[PDB]
Curated annotation (Swiss-Prot):
Start and end residues of each Macro domain: 1-167
Gene this protein is translated from: rep
Activity regulation summary: Inhibited in vitro by GRL-0617.
Membrane topology field: Multi-pass membrane protein
Source species: Severe acute respiratory syndrome coronavirus 2 (2019-nCoV)
Name this polypeptide is given: Papain-like protease nsp3
Summary of the function given for this chain in its UniProt record: Responsible for the cleavages located at the N-terminus of the replicase polyprotein. Participates together with nsp4 in the assembly of virally-induced cytoplasmic double-membrane vesicles necessary for viral replication. Antagonizes innate immune induction of type I interferon by blocking the phosphorylation, dimerization and subsequent nuclear translocation of host IRF3. Also prevents host NF-kappa-B signaling. In addition, PL-PRO possesses a deubiquitinating/deISGylating activity and processes both 'Lys-48'- and 'Lys-63'-linked polyubiquitin chains from cellular substrates.
Chemical reaction(s) catalysed: Thiol-dependent hydrolysis of ester, thioester, amide, peptide and isopeptide bonds formed by the C-terminal Gly of ubiquitin (a 76-residue protein attached to proteins as an intracellular targeting signal)
Subcellular locations according to the entry: Host endoplasmic reticulum membrane
Amino acid sequence: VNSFSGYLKLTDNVYIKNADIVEEAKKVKPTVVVNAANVYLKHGGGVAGALNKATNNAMQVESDDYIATNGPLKVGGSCVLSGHNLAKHCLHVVGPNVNKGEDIQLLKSAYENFNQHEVLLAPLLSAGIFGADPIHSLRVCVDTVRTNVYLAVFDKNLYDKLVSSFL
Ligand SMILES: O=C(Nc1ccc(C(=O)N[C@@H]2c3cccc(O)c3C[C@@H]2C(=O)O)cc1)NC1CC1
């Protein structure tokens, strides 16, 4: 039993809720919150900009030190950093950005990072300003992630479309 409340169960291991991932992170304090990162960990907008704002820019400061030491991530890759005031850890995962021409097949590789964590609060990878179809992203999530994932979908209309179209 965990403290995530009000989720609809999609499969054995995937749950979904119309929620602001920032507010959900502040209330649950999960072990892992997933960020929709880019390879430079420049948290300007979308989920990343919101999570970073909620940390008063501490996420960005930590991220800049990480990049200065290690260089950029790979598209499809990830790193574990602090969750600051939102979670124990933040798993920064880089899904492909369609608005940069990146290969959508890398979306499965991106979701594979979730399997290294038993439970996660996460957004749909490559959705929103990353330009992928969120229905496709949800399908890849369900078919790739085997650990327990709680998906927060900010947009109520997108949320009900995701639920109503889910196979
Ligand atoms: O600002 C915040 N939270 C905040 C939370 C999420 C986002 C964001 O970009 N969401 C994206 C979106 C939007 C529309 C359609 C989509 O497919 C997606 C994918 C992605 C998602 O929903 O996961 C932005 C901001 N909180 C403080 C109090 C105001």
